[PDB]
Write a protein that binds this ligand. Structure first.
Ligand code: SF4
Ligand code: SF4
Ligand code: SF4
Ligand code: SF4
Ligand code: FES
Ligand SMILES: [Zn+2]
Lengths: 118, 98, 182, 48, 689, 63, 85, 56, 92, 279
């Protein structure tokens, strides 16, 4: 359950899970999540901007609690120490690459948490 | 007569701002009703604007060249007094413009 | 409590409902004295929830504006603004909201500045004031608040839907005899 | 080093500027004649 | 039989016997959930969400469709009513797809707002749900037909409001689909309002799709300028970006509907914008400059140029304040003409609001009995007015036309397409003359484009004599049926201040194009004339100008507009103009001060004091000042020319979705032109109606 | 300005503000806020009471 | 089964359908049964005649012709056709 | 499969209010304040009794 | 192959400017997920209605969605509106 | 009226199908539209014998057929033209002394379009006032009608021209249709209505044509033979005419296989010929 670093997950096919529903943006207590959405040319509903201010984030897990597709999560990585306030400004690129890096352990923990009521 | 015919060249605009249902504007309203088409026919190319509001005071604004405005009060004025005010306004152009 | 009881003075003080006449004190206003006089003549004499003509009233900066807190050494711009007072009904998209709207007068200040700071493309408002509108249960209360804080007010009155004869029998009305209509 | 592209993308979403002509152009009197840069095509103007 | 008494939750209430249960409850502040009953549509009992308990009745009773019975007791808060509402909600949500995150209706959904309050709370339908393939209605309506709840609101709206017949319930059972049986688009000039009347995300605004959520938007009430009716609208924005436009309830203007241009041409303000003053070189290269340099250049040109060679052009989006500023500035320079185009001028004198306004107001078509269009196409010029006219024609309104045979949704007689019919009616030797004579209330609607013809004054005089001799303008019944449907808010505002559109400067060396972008020809401006353009988008006026001064859009300034019936509406500042653009009156004031003829306006308050000096009625907002000189102004005069050319009377609008610079600079309007123009183009009328 | 920030947020979005009131005792403040919300809703947390989780973790917080 | 028109070429708009001269004499009796102000009622008998003369199936062009004959909306004709099995 | 009574029908939302006139008020003072008795129309037994009856 | 912004292309692609390369989406949407899901082929299902949950279990994917494979045109691929998977009938 | 036979018989059976426009007109609808065109011409001072040059190109079959039948009803002469350049258009306008010219603006006259060619030939249209009679160089040129979408100064739209007269308030009177009145001028020869009817009968008897059999006229419809075997045949004997202007032979074959026995008037550079029934 440890709430580490905000990260964006993707389906096993490689398609990103986020559907740009802004529920995490509405549910963020500190308003650290900014989402701007434009439909993709194929017709899907995806974010063109998904920014999380890690300086405005209280690491509370409400984004992953409110995500209906388990796209945004908080991975166990706590060694996210940065030397620049700009480096602390996460964007969709950083979140997606972080989710790609940390998907296996995130997948294992999320699988265990899903199996608890299941 | 002559001053009515001279409105086209003596002035640049004539605006009548008054009220529909007030005793202050009764004379101005009656004069506009009676004498609008006489002036309009004598001066087919002259701007003769008529505006009315719920409680506006009766004013006859004479606009001369270079946008020189000569609004004049016309409250509780008989049709003769309205005609005299308009005649005075169409006779100040030589003094006002120079 | 949108509608104060007009049958009794306890609705609100008569002084609050009064709209003071403009006094020309600027050079341009002295030049445009007839315009000021005519605006005073034509403007509504009282502001009540039963009115039908919207109107803009200037910010009366006098002892009435005494009870403001926004005239800060660092902020000399708030206490001159003109708010907009109007009842904001629920948007046309939905008709049965969880939290119904239209039971209060919204008082809204115009946006002074909005720009996207470029490092993260983040919306920044140059004026932290006017970010969120105020809500008042009564138009008299909103006007009193404007007078106390030295704000001018553009009041626009709500436009409600007309009552209509509704019945299911209207779906099966008899057209009429063919010969008679011809 | 590619920040200006992102800033222009930000600005163009709400206040995309008008690309004024830059250089010599055809003049029909006082009007500069430049072809419309609309990607869409008015098919009613090209039909039958 | 007049004032019966009922009981709502044990509380006595005096109601009228013609009320429904839902109306009686709503009048007393009791909110009853509903999905199909629309307050402006015919009553249907498709859903059952309004079922309520009544004492001494066995069945639950549909509150929306059932009239009030004297002495009845309605128990809305009772547990039986709670059970009824829970059952109906459970049945509604049984086959509803789990699509709330991907659905634009979330946060503003009646289904969600009622399931959260009146539903049971949890589901038990653990089965396969029905699935319906989505349909294609065009670039304005996004369809997810699996989310539909079969409430027939769209069908009723299309049949009763829009007047088109393309929606319905096909099939029966649980496989019934609400839409076009064949694959066609939903193009009715009101295609954006079915999104409003759809309670669920089955019909969503395609241009707005996926963009935002209701909880992150701030709404401002303003007035439209895309049509001369000035329909009241609600603009929802997220920060500096305007997100969507929605209708607002105004029974005096547009009821609760808006046209596609009003709803979907706002995005034309988000591209092709002018954000800095620009100067054009000899070869045509445009260079951005400062405000000071442009003001100095224009002031120098104003000072050295003789007054008789100074002209101006008043655009479509010119408001009362901007036109007042320009008029006063040009008066201070002894300029008395505000038009340089010698072709396409309105032949209506600015002397009387009776002369230049719709004297019967928008409600006149409801009041009037006979309507006569003269070169007017209400389907394009004002779709909401067209819907109102259709509603009136359903009851007791008869419509005739003396222009192009349009494709209005209702039946209209076609008297002709030329002025010969008008001449015959003026002479009185026409069958329609007796039709006007016997009519209780005649009404004439003549387009501003029709009055802008070369024989515009003659056509105006012919219409005036027709109105006087027939009874269109009658003092016996206090009726003034002469109405002119304008096409430019700028023209309406210019007329409202006393600017004669016939005052044309034949040879002008200094031209102020005040946002004008339509009906502009390269030969209308001399090749050696210095041109300033107070514009917002660069389409024509930017190319016609030596100097370009960016201005603020209708959503970017506090402006006063005149709805063609005469309404003073106050458009409000939603978002500041982009870049360093300034509202036009401020630019004109700065130019006047720099030119040695300063204007006495330091603020909008003083500018409106000046306006009150000109016309006090412009300070009374959302109000129509009655005109006591209607018959005096519109009286027939002897000797005035009435000669009319036999050429056909035409309607100026060709492409509805592209009529102004903002519309032409809109992606949504471009998609609409690509999709619907050929489908809505027909050289022959729709005989089947 | 924690009170104002809570007033400008929904009930749940202002709940984490009580963690930082007494960061030494971060769960008793949560319990007080939740009890206030329940009293406003006129209910009780049957699951929390029957699982003994609230009392146990409040005593751990006291420790 | 399906409540929408299948994208079949054999049932497209270009398919011809005109009532046989005997049917044109038959619809006169059908129209006479219902009031002249209500020609909408004859949609079901017209569909039955179409099915009789068109190989026991009603094509979309036949629906168009029926809608044009009775001065009733084509969408309404489609609703009538689909509602009945 | 039992969802009808998921939401709690009975809730602890009962509020009770008690209003009391000032203790120092006399009967005649209360009658005058409520309007059933006139200000100067006091010290008359018949008028006091009529006001008391109307108040009751 | 067809030029975008044309009537046919817009009507086909839900009145949107279709991009075949999808690297335009890689820039605008900051993800190559469009290409990654274009790599996935079409799934053929016998039934008229298919059910997609995004994965193997509930809560491991997206909420259950039912896709109608019985379309106006036989064998029309239908895309999931939560994931990017495409489904179609086995034969038509 | 010679063309009112099938209108009087039933009036509800289909008369003409415009496949390229997907518009089907019954006899009642066709009569209404042609009367609208005739009344529109009559109200614009079009007396008998006035010339109208048909510059419309193949695709707009419905407009061409409506113009032909209306000119037959209105009594004005209809002359098809094949101008592909400004010089050819000028020569045709001068020789024919045409009162009106009906054209398709977007058709390609080589490098330029028809509307641009008209503007070049007639420079006075650009500066023509709104609602004012044009002052053109040509002696009797009075109307330029176009079936386009946009509005060009000096020209009027096809729908703007037509007047759908009513049964009560109509004042215009349509003259009786005359067999001897000239209707077509094709190939430097004049076809009368009676001549066209005789040609229709001759082609019906010599090409094995029944009263009830579809006739598919492909490509251009301005030819006198195409008019005779198309809409005129429908008005005379009720034959179902299908117009396939600017359609490929494969699509024509599809829309013919939709029918049983189709007489295929094949489009070509020379006057349209005909082939056997069905395939
Ligand atoms: S953990 Fe909480 S504060 Fe941080 S981004 Fe997620 S919702 Fe916002
Ligand atoms: S809650 Fe999940 S699906 Fe919704 S916008 Fe946030 S990350 Fe995307
Ligand atoms: S319409 Fe949309 S928001 Fe409403 S219940 Fe259905 S999926 Fe959810
Ligand atoms: S599509 Fe929408 S408006 Fe139409 S019946 Fe379904 S839920 Fe109602
Ligand atoms: S709201 Fe009454 S049945 Fe639908
Ligand atoms: Zn899926």
């Amino acid at each position: 359950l440890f709430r580490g670093e905000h990260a964006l997950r993707r389906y096993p096919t490689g398609e990103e899970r986020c559907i740009a529903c802004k529920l995490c943006q509405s549910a963020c207590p500190a308003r650290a999540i900014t989402i701007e959405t434009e439909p993709r040319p194929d017709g899907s509903r995806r974010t063109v901007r998904y920014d999380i201010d890690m300086t405005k984030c209280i690491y509370c897990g409400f984004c992953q609690e409110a995500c209906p597709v388990d796209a945004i999560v908080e991975g166990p990585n706590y060694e996210q120490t940065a030397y620049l306030h700009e480096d602390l400004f996460y964007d969709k690129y950083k979140l997606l690459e972080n989710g790609d890096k940390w998907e296996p352990q995130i997948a294992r923990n999320i699988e265990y948490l899903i199996n608890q009521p299941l | 007569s002559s001053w009515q015919k001279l409105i086209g060249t003596n002035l640049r605009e004539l605006r009548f701002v008054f009220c529909q249902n007030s005793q202050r504007s009764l004379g101005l309203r009656n004069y506009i009703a009676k004498n609008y088409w006489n002036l309009k026919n004598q001066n087919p190319n002259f701007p003769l604007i008529v505006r009315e509001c719920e409680e506006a005071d009766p004013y006859i604004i004479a606009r001369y060249q270079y946008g020189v405005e000569k609004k004049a009060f016309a409250a509780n004025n008989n049709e003769a007094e309205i005609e005299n005010i308009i005649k005075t306004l169409v006779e100040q152009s030589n003094k006002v413009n120079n | 409590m949108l509608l104060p009881k007009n049958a009794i003075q306890s609705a609100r003080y008569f002084e609050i409902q009064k709209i003071p006449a403009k006094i020309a004190k600027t050079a341009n206003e002295k030049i445009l004295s007839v315009g000021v006089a005519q605006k005073n003549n034509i403007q509504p004499k009282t502001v009540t929830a039963q009115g039908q003509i919207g109107f803009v009233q200037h910010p009366q900066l006098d002892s009435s504006c005494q009870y403001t807190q926004f005239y800060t050494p660092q902020r000399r711009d708030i206490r001159g603004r003109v708010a907009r007072i109007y009842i904001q009904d629920t948007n046309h998209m939905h008709d049965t909201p969880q939290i119904p709207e239209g039971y209060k007068w919204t008082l809204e200040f115009e946006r002074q500045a909005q720009y996207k700071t470029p490092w993260m493309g983040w919306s920044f408002n140059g004026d932290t004031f006017s970010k969120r509108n105020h809500y008042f249960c009564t138009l008299e209360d909103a006007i009193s608040y404007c007078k106390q804080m030295g704000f001018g007010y553009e009041v626009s009155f709500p436009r409600s839907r007309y009552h209509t004869r509704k019945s299911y029998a209207d779906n099966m009305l008899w057209p009429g005899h063919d010969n008679a209509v011809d | 080093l590619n920040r200006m592209r992102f800033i222009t993308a930000q600005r163009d979403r709400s206040r995309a500027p008008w690309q004024s002509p830059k250089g010599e152009g055809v003049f029909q009197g006082k009007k500069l004649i430049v072809a419309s840069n609309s990607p869409f095509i008015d098919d009613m103007s090209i039909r039958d | 039989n007049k004032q019966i008494e009922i009981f709502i939750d044990g509380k006595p209430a005096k109601v009228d016997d013609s009320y429904t249960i839902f109306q009686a409850c709503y009048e007393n502040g009791v909110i009853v959930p509903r999905f199909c009953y629309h307050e402006r549509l015919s009553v249907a009992g498709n859903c059952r969400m309004c079922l309520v308990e009544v004492e001494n009745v066995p069945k639950p009773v549909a509150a929306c469709a059932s009239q009030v019975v004297p002495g009845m007791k309605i128990k809305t808060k009772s547990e039986k009513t709670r059970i009824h509402r829970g059952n109906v909600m459970e049945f509604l949500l049984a086959n509803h797809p789990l699509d709330c995150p991907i659905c634009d209706q979330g946060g503003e959904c009646d289904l969600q707002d009622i399931s959260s309050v009146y539903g049971y709370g949890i589901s038990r339908y653990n089965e396969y749900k029905r699935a319906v393939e989505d349909k294609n209605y065009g670039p304005l309506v996004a369809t997810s037909m699996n989310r539909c709840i079969h409430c027939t609101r769209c069908v009723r709206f299309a049949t009763q409001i829009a007047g088109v017949e393309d929606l319905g319930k096909t099939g029966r059972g649980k496989a019934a689909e609400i839409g076009t049986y064949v694959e066609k688009t939903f193009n009715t000039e009101l295609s954006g309002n079915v999104v409003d009347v759809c309670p669920v995300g089955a019909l969503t605004n395609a241009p707005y799709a996926f963009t935002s959520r209701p909880w992150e938007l701030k709404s401002f009430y303003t007035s439209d300028v895309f049509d001369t009716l000035g329909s009241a609208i609600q603009v929802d924005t997220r920060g500096p970006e305007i997100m969507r436009v929605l209708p607002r309830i105004h029974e005096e203007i547009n009821e609760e509907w808006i046209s596609d241009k009003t709803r979907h041409a706002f995005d034309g303000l988000k591209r092709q914008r002018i954000n800095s003053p620009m100067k054009r070189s000899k070869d045509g290269n445009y260079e951005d400059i400062f405000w000071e340099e442009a003001i100095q250049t224009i002031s120098k040109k104003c000072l050295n140029t003789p007054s008789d060679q100074i002209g101006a052009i008043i655009g479509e989006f010119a408001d009362i304040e901007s036109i007042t500023a320009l008029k006063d500035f040009l008066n201070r320079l002894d300029v008395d003409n505000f038009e340089v185009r010698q072709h396409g001028n309105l032949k209506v004198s600015p002397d009387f609001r009776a002369n230049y306004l719709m004297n019967s107001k928008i409600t006149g078509v409801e009041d009037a009995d006979v309507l006569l269009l003269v070169g007017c196409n209400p389907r394009y010029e004002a779709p909401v007015l067209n819907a109102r006219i259709l509603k009136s024609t359903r009851k007791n309104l008869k419509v005739f036309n003396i222009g192009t045979n349009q494709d209005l949704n209702y039946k209209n007689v076609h008297l002709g397409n030329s002025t010969k019919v008008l001449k015959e009616i003026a002479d009185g030797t026409h069958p329609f003359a007796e039709r006007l004579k016997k009519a209780k209330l005649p009404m004439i609607m003549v387009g501003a484009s029709a009055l802008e013809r070369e024989d515009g004054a003659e056509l105006y005089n012919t219409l005036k004599v027709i109105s006087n001799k027939t009874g269109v303008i009658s003092e016996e019944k206090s009726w003034n049926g002469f109405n002119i449907l304008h096409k430019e808010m700028g023209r309406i505002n210019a007329l409202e201040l006393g600017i004669n559109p016939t005052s044309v400067n034949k040879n002008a060396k200094l031209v102020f194009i005040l946002g004008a972008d339509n009906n502009l020809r390269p030969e209308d401006i001399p090749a050696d004339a210095f041109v300033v353009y107070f514009g917002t988008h660069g389409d024509e006026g930017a190319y016609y100008a030596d100097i370009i001064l960016p201005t603020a859009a209708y959503t970017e300034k506090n402006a006063t507009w005149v709805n063609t019936e005469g309404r003073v509406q106050q458009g409000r500042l939603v978002v500041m103009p982009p870049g360093d653009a300034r509202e036009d009156w401020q630019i004109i004031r700065a130019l006047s001060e720099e030119a040695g003829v300063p204007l006495p306006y330091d603020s909008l308050e003083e500018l409106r004091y000046r306006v009150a000096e000109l016309a006090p009625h412009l300070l009374k907002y959302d109000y129509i000042e009655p005109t006591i000189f209607g018959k005096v102004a519109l009286s027939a005069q002897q000797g005035v020319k009435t000669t009319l050319s036999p050429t056909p009377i035409t309607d100026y609008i060709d492409n509805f979705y592209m009529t102004d610079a903002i519309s032409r600079a809109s992606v949504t309007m471009a998609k609409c032109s690509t999709a619907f123009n050929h489908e809505k183009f027909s050289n022959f009328k729709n005989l089947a109606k | 300005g924690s009170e104002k920030l809570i007033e400008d947020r929904p009930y749940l979005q202002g709940m984490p503000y009580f963690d930082r009131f007494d960061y030494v005792s971060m769960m008793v403040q949560e319990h007080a806020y939740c009890l206030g919300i329940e009293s406003l809703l006129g209910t009780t947390n049957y699951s929390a009471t029957f699982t003994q989780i609230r009392t146990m973790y409040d005593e751990l917080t006291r420790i | 089964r399906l409540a929408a028109h299948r994208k079949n070429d054999d049932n497209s708009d270009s398919v011809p359908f005109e009532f046989t001269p005997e049917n044109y004499k038959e619809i006169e009796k059908i129209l006479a049964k219902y009031p002249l102000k209500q020609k909408r009622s004859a949609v079901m008998p017209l569909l039955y005649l179409v099915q009789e003369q068109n190989n026991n199936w009603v094509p979309l062009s036949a629906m168009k012709k029926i809608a044009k004959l009775l001065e009733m909306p084509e969408i309404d004709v489609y609703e009538v056709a689909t509602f009945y099995t | 499969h039992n969802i009808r009574y998921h939401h709690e029908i009975h809730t602890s939302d009962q509020t009770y209010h008690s209003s009391y006139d000032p203790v120092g008020e006399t009967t005649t003072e209360r009658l005058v304040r409520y309007g059933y008795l006139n200000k100067d129309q006091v010290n008359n037994a018949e008028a006091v009794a009529a006001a008391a009856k109307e108040f009751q | 192959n067809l030029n975008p912004y044309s009537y046919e292309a817009l009507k086909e692609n839900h009145w949107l400017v279709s991009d075949s390369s999808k690297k335009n989406s890689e820039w605008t949407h900051k993800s190559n997920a469009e290409q990654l899901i274009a790599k996935v082929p079409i799934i053929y299902v016998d039934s008229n209605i298919v059910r997609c949950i995004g994965g193997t279990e509930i809560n491991a994917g997206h909420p259950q969605v039912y896709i109608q494979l019985d379309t106006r045109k036989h064998g029309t691929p239908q895309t999931c509106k939560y994931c990017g998977l495409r489904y179609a009938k086995k034969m038509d | 009226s010679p063309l009112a036979a099938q209108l009087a018989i039933n009036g509800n059976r289909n008369a003409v199908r415009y496949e390229n426009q997907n518009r089907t007109w019954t006899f009642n609808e066709l009569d209404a539209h042609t009367n609208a065109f005739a009344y529109g011409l009559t109200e614009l001072g079009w007396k008998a014998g006035d010339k109208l040059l048909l510059w419309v190109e193949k695709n707009h079959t419905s407009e061409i057929t409506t113009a032909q039948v209306g000119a037959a009803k209105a009594g004005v002469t209809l002359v098809p033209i094949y101008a592909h350049s400004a010089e050819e258009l000028e020569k045709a306008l001068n020789d024919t002394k045409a009162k009106g010219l009906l054209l398709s603006p977007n058709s390609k006259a080589g490098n330029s379009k028809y509307i641009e060619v008209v503007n070049k030939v007639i420079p006075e249209l650009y500066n023509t006032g709104r609602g004012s009679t044009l002052k053109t160089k040509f002696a009797n040129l009075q109307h330029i009608i176009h079936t386009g979408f946009y509005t060009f100064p000096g020209t009027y739209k096809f729908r703007q021209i037509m007047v759908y007269a009513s049964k009560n308030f109509n004042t215009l009177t349509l003259p009786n249709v005359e067999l001897n009145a000239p209707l077509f001028i094709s190939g430097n020869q004049t076809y009368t209505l009676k001549d066209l009817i005789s040609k229709t009968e001759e082609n019906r008897k010599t090409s094995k044509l029944n009263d009830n059999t579809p006739v598919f006229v492909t490509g251009d419809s301005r030819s006198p033979l195409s008019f005779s075997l198309g809409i005129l045949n429908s008005l005379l004997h009720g034959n179902y005419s299908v117009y396939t202007g600017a359609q490929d032979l494969n699509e024509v074959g599809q829309t013919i296989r939709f029918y049983d026995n189709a007489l295929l008037l094949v489009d070509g550079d020379i006057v349209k010929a005909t082939q056997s029934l069905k395939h």
